[PDB]
Design a protein around this ligand. Structure first.
Ligand SMILES: Cc1c(C)n(Cc2ccc(-c3ccccc3C(=O)O)cc2)c2ccc(C(=O)N[C@H](C)c3ccc([N+](=O)[O-])cc3)cc12
Ligand SMILES: Cc1c(C)n(Cc2ccc(-c3ccccc3C(=O)O)cc2)c2ccc(C(=O)N[C@H](C)c3ccc([N+](=O)[O-])cc3)cc12
Lengths: 254, 262
């Protein structure tokens, strides 16, 4: 059984590597020092990064940034979908259930992985070629300035766990196979798979972090912070439905 | 398997179970004995309508307002019980006082809904220390916004009760809930976290011994936290509606104090 647990952990790791270009190890290497990324700390550096970078979706700053985040989210959704398909048992599930699990899981996964790109002072952007400051994002006009902040608070807590990519792969898989998403038709094989994934995660944390007491529990506890962050994000998405500022574009985004 | 550290963990579990029994008059064992017709305990009077509500007000020790007040009183008593219990958790009273206060303030609701599940089935809830049973439909028939108070608690309780926890499991789980290091405004997170870590080891051991053929119960239980916090938030929003719709109704200052800054 342990054999299958480690084989699973490895499979998931390889698949995570193939699906997500910018890994946590890479991101960390960039954030600490190892070809320094362009830094966006204010208006002028933003404009410079627009001209010198590849972020023009051919007019107010906060709205442009928000839309960028949108575009990148749609890409992430495709990457996560591809990863989900590699989870043993996943494609064998009822197709409606696959859709439901992805639809409810992508936000939680996006914030999880976003933590890998973040420190307390900012977030790697543009494939890791840039770094936008926390203070700059906070300085954005309301309510756009309040979007990223809760996520920095989450990431600071989450990053304290010092998980690596091989831990994260399994964790993300556990997140996808959540039996309590609304509207599931057949919960049983979902919870069966998830229980296998949770055993794999347990073994992984125990081997990879022998000195981290109850890391498994703390990680599981982080799911509360994730769901909360997702709820809050939704809550201020509703507020943006004020702000009177591409119908095909309006179609591409959920 | 038997060894020194795990012996310590079992000792902690026994301690907590013992304090739990001492602190909470109405256990899940007694609740279940009452709900399932066990001869250890007497049968409850059932309130399912206004008529039986009026018969019950006699046979038992505006309508929605009166029910809500009884619920208030009971909640106060529960805060007292949980506080008493919290003091027995090793290390809790040694923490910074303000942090003890914060921990209680945020833990009390999550615990109340957790234990409330013990008194529930899909059809209703035990009341008046188990002498009564108020049906789910009757509570749902109450005038808005009072008719929507209890439904979420029921849904949560059917889910949570699916875990089949007994009192000895709950004692540790409740201890784990109290000692959450992510409560807002904590001065000293670390010692809280060390205690919770010990409590989590204890919970893990307890579930694996008490539910051997129950795969990943520890994980499922920990995941119930999401359900708890959602319930608490919905309830708080509903109370916000209440305060504005019924300015003639008095909320208890202890409860108001728990609600301030949430
Ligand atoms: C995947 C992802 C990355 C890499 N960043 C950092 C980022 C990404 C792009 C830029 C950027 C800005 C300007 C110019 C270029 C770039 C650039 O990096 O390319 C900066 C930081 C994110 C920030 C927020 C979210 C988020 O909250 N998503 C949820 C699901 C959501 C989001 C939105 C909605 N919604 O509105 O409906 C729902 C759910 C997601 C991401
Ligand atoms: C501790 C507790 C118990 C045992 N029950 C079941 C119950 C308790 C008492 C009765 C009862 C009803 C009528 C007559 C006698 C009894 C009886 O059992 O004694 C029935 C079931 C509860 C139900 C709801 C809440 C709750 O959400 N409280 C918050 C703080 C709140 C609660 C209320 C309000 N509010 O509306 O003012 C705000 C916030 C708390 C409890």
């Amino acid at each position: 059984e342990s054999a299958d647990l480690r084989a699973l952990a490895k499979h998931l790791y390889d698949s995570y590597i193939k699906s997500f270009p910018l890994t946590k190890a890479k991101a960390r290497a960039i954030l600490t020092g190892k070809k320094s990324p362009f830094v966006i700390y204010d208006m002028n550096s933003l404009m410079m990064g627009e001209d010198k970078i590849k972020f023009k979706h051919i007019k107010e700053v906060a709205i442009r940034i928000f839309q960028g985040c949108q575009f990148r989210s749609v890409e992430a959704v495709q990457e996560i979908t591809e990863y989900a398909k590699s989870i043993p048992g996943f494609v064998n599930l009822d197709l409606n259930d696959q859709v439901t699990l992805l639809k409810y899981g992508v936000h939680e996964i996006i914030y999880t992985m976003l933590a890998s790109l973040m420190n307390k002072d900012g977030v790697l952007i543009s494939e890791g070629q840039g770094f936008m400051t926390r203070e700059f994002l906070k300085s954005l006009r309301k309510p756009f300035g309040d979007f990223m902040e809760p996520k920095f608070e989450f990431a600071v807590k989450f990053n304290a766990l010092e998980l690596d990519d091989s831990d994260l792969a399994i964790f993300i898989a556990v997140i996808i196979l959540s039996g309590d998403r609304p509207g599931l038709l057949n919960v049983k094989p979902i919870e069966d798979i998830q229980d296998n994934l949770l055993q794999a995660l347990e073994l992984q944390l125990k081997l990879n972090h022998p000195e981290s007491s109850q890391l498994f529990a703390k990680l599981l506890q982080k799911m509360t912070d994730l769901r909360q962050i997702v709820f809050e994000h939704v809550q201020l998405l509703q507020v943006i439905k004020k702000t009177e500022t591409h119908p095909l574009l309006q179609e591409i985004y959920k």
